[PDB]
Amino acid sequence: SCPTHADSLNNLANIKREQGNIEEAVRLYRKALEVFPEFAAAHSNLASVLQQQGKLQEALMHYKEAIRISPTFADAYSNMGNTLKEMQDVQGALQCYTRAIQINPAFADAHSNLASIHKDSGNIPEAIASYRTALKLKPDFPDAYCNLAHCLQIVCDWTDYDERMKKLVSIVADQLEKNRLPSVHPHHSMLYPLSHGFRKAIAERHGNLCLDKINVLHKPPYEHPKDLKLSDGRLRVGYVSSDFGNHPTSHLMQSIPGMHNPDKFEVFCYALSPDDGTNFRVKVMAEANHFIDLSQIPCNGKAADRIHQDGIHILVNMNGYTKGARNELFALRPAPIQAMWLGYPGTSGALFMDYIITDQETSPAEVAEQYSEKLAYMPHTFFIGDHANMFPHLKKKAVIDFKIYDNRIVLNGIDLKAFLDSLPDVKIVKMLNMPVIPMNTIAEAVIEMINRGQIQITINGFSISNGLATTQINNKAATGEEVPRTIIVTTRSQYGLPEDAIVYCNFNQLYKIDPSTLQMWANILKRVPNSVLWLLRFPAVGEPNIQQYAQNMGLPQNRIIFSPVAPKEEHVRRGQLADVCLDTPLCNGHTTGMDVLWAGTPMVTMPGETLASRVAASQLTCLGCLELIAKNRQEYEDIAVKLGTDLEYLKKVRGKVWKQRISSPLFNTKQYTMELERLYLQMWEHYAAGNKPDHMIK
Amino acid sequence: VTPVSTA
Ligand SMILES: *OP(=O)(O)OP(=O)(O)OC[C@H]1O[C@@H](n2ccc(=O)[nH]c2=O)[C@H](O)[C@@H]1O
């Protein structure tokens, strides 16, 4: 019954917790509460260690008690909130944060937590506002500072940028050395000039969050298979992803499970997310040898069991530290070999992951120390895209001459050839080769549809569709779930691009741009007069900020053109209108790289040091275009400028990309799978020979 | 509406 006894047991548990003996801390907290059940701080403390353990159901119950006992316990409201947030109850979590702020207007954490809800919802200015409040209230607040730094990054606010970066690095350095969880997220760590064994350590440290959550299951190590006898000579590969559905990762690899050779491999796909109804999910389900819905098995222990009992040899992590991940599954270690692949552009830092599937251009051996996993090399690029399958209507194009330009008025369509054969005066410019409709009555009808902004027209019985209206014609085609069944017109005038200008595009989200990158681009734009830069409102609130820094750098408003974010198919297609694409060196376009290359638009890149900044170079190396890879900023500007000023060289490079995108291995999902299969077999031969993982650099 | 890789 004694509050002073209970108080002691609390202090003793706080001690066992500092030494990370969480096991024992709980036992003590629980005794403290058996002695004195009305003890507010013991309830709160027990709750926050249950939250660390992922026992959210029970952690919540103890937070509620803490509040009942001490109603002004602002701190407990805030943590309850975090628990509800992790339990997917964002509504009630938000109510907790607001309620804390009412009780203690001066309490920084609740402000920060509130800002976190806003950030997640995509409303970034309200996120900034709340983070700023928190920092006014508590100027030394690493979590809020870094989160704010990221929001600012997202909207391209570069106020006191250089000083801001030095502080982030400083904050991380301090947290790593004090053995705290860093405030920068591993999935963001490539955006900041971090000291790089740092990036690895930030990842490592997020890996640990899993260990704590799986220990409470007390699961013995699993017994992995040591031959292929049970699995009938077939190597069992499990792909684990929360992204079998409408997601970039599916837009890259949806064709792969079906392309595996069924004589040597048995393919299991473990979905971490429910069926979103899209064709992407349909395909994977239909083509994988086995499809397993783990969103129905929410307990990590039971799910890992299932993986093991299915008999997997290689388990593939397609998530890393992206939303939806359940790395606890990998931490449980149900398969003898476990590899990172494709979905996450960095190291996991975790011991439970064995290999990272990458390539020699992305991760040269010089920089093996960036990754905790052993490197496993694909022979060309580890990147792949499903564009050949998704958007075959962009394999060939045709243009309208309105005065011979390949990117001013563009037609694509499965039945394009047939339509052109019904026309009288088609000229065939050689390169395949590109048909050119002359300015006749037909050409005018097409242009009129585009100018008047109409949905579609008919010409000689063929359906001609307006490129801006595809979601109205066939919504599944707009998303990339179907191949369009009409001929589609795409024009510069549609997006307010000048008919007779050099267009430099970048279709990435704006967070990938930094003040140096924008400087580089300004340099290129001044040196190539009449040229424009083509960017997306991604997000829209970022636009005025860029316009601002642009004019600061002496570029009138009209030299940068912003378009809205398009549906997947329109987005890929309208790349055809660009002349060159300028790739962000901070963090490369990834899926976006593939998207711009599929349109046959050359892309200038400058491979940095981090994985994420080397992918574009890797894609280009594979395509066979070494002349678009710069060694430094001066070279980047030069390549770009040459492309803009020397029209003969441009046509040459553009033609080379247009050709190579079929003929190189870059978009060839069959060849890719086969290379991936060879890599898997290497990893296995090695393991079955009794060896621990080492580099597979061929 | 237009899905992206998120942290
Ligand atoms: O994987 P990346 O880092 O290259 O791409 P993001 O993770 O930033 O997400 C981009 C996704 O958005 C698509 N997209 C771009 C522009 C647009 O107008 N529409 C659109 O859907 C990209 O295709 C990619 O899937």
Author numbering:
A (entry chain D): 312 to 714, 719 to 746, 762 to 1028
B (entry chain H): 2 to 8
What does the paper say about this structure?
We consequently envisaged a set of bisubstrate OGT inhibitors in the form of UDP–peptide conjugates in which UDP is coupled to a variable peptide subunit by a suitable linker. The weakly binding GlcNAc moiety was omitted from the inhibitor structure and replaced with a linear three- or four-carbon tether to retain the spatial arrangement of UDP and peptide as observed in the Michaelis complex. The resulting compounds were named goblin1 (OGT bisubstrate-linked inhibitor 1) and goblin2 respectively. In the present paper, we have reported the first examples of functional OGT bisubstrate inhibitors featuring a short linker replacing the GlcNAc moiety of the donor substrate and covalently connecting a uridyl diphosphate ‘binding anchor’ to an acceptor peptide. In vitro glycosylation of a peptide substrate was inhibited in a dose-dependent manner with an IC50 value of 18 μM for goblin1 and 40 μM for goblin2. The crystal structure of the hOGT–goblin1 complex reveals the structural mimicry offered by the inhibitor, with both UDP and peptide moieties retaining the alignment observed in the Michaelis complex. As envisaged, UDP adopts the same conformation as observed in the hOGT Michaelis complex (maximum atom shift, 0.6 Å) and the peptide occupies the −4 to +2 subsites with a similar backbone conformation (maximum backbone atom shift near O-GlcNAc site, 0.9 Å). The three-carbon linker connects the two components apparently without introducing any strain, allowing both the UDP moiety and the peptide part of the inhibitor to adopt the optimal position in the binding site, effectively mimicking the natural substrates. As expected for a bisubstrate inhibitor, both fragments add synergistically to the inhibition: the ‘linker-only’ derivative of UDP was shown to be an order of magnitude less potent an inhibitor, whereas the ‘linker-only’ acceptor peptide was neither a substrate for the OGT nor an inhibitor. Attempts to inhibit OGT in cells appeared unsuccessful, probably due to the size/negative charge of the compounds.
